[PDB]
């Protein structure tokens, strides 16, 4: 259970969608982060993989602001304190808004996987994962925006998949957080995206996954192919 409280882009801090505060007000602050109704700091599980909730978490609604970021530079995502039990991958995507992200219909977004980290050391189940490294780094995850990416308006979708209960069907817990960004500089490249409601199936091997048994077979990070 947790959420992204803010991000750093081009070295500038942007406050996120404070889901434990902003829903409890008529007129919360503007943010680059999408609003959600996930006030229990909870998740979308496999029962919702085909729901609009998987896109940006949820009942999510477009953030009002947009952060500029140079292609080829780093974004830091500051999570709230992440529980050790919730081992799993960190996956980050870009979807073009093809227009203004403040008004794009989220149901139309097609996400390209730009970063993904999974099982780091599975010598001893339940293993050490991407989220374990995030915990150790002041509950912060980092990605690089590809240097060759086309300049434009994008939804940045950053997600933890907790796998502590993932041996159960629909037991994997997805924690997507979305932000509006404007990539500057860059090149001409873009991936071919996947609708949010097409990212995952509850039968995918990295979704219906047992962290507690021998990990000699590794961990197949779910979702579409990683962009190069
Ligand atoms: C740790 O993260 C918090 C937000 O969770 C941030 O406010 C603080 O500045 C960070 N500490 C360091 C040393 O960067
Ligand atoms: Cu939890």
Curated annotation (Swiss-Prot):
Gene Ontology CC: extracellular region
Record keyword Secreted present: yes
EC number in record: 1.14.99.56
Glycosylated residue positions: 138
Induction: Expression is highly induced in complex biomass like sugarcane bagasse (SEB), Avicel(R) PH-101, and CM-cellulose.
Spans traversing the lipid bilayer: none
Temperature dependence per UniProt: Optimum temperature is 60 degrees Celsius.
Top-level EC class: oxidoreductase
Cofactor: Cu(2+)
Name of the molecule in the record: AA9 family lytic polysaccharide monooxygenase B
Originating organism: Aspergillus fumigatus (strain ATCC MYA-4609 / CBS 101355 / FGSC A1100 / Af293)
């Amino acid at each position: 259970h947790g959420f992204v409280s803010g991000i750093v882009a081009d070295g500038k801090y942007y406050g996120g969608y404070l889901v434990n505060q902003y829903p409890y007000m008529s007129n919360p602050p503007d943010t680059i982060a999408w609003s959600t109704t996930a006030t229990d700091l909870g998740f979308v599980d496999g029962t919702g993989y085909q729901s609009p909730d998987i896109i940006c978490h949820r009942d999510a609604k477009n953030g009002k602001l947009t952060a500029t970021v140079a292609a080829g530079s780093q974004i830091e995502f500051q999570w709230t304190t992440w529980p050790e039990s919730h081992h799993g991958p960190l996956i980050t995507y870009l979807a073009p808004c093809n227009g203004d992200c403040a008004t794009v219909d989220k149901t139309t977004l097609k996400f390209v996987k730009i970063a993904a980290q999974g099982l780091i050391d599975g010598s001893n189940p339940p293993g050490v994962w991407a989220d374990d490294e995030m915990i150790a780094n002041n509950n912060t995850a980092t990605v690089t925006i590809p240097a060759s990416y086309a300049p434009g308006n994008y939804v940045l979708r950053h997600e933890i998949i907790a796998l502590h209960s993932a041996g159960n069907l629909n037991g994997a817990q997805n924690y997507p957080q979305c932000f509006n960004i404007q990539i500057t500089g860059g090149g001409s490249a873009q991936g071919s995206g996947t609708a949010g409601t097409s990212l995952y199936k509850n039968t995918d091997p990295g979704i219906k996954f047992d962290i507690y048994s021998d990990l000699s077979g590794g961990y197949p990070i779910p979702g579409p192919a990683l962009f190069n």
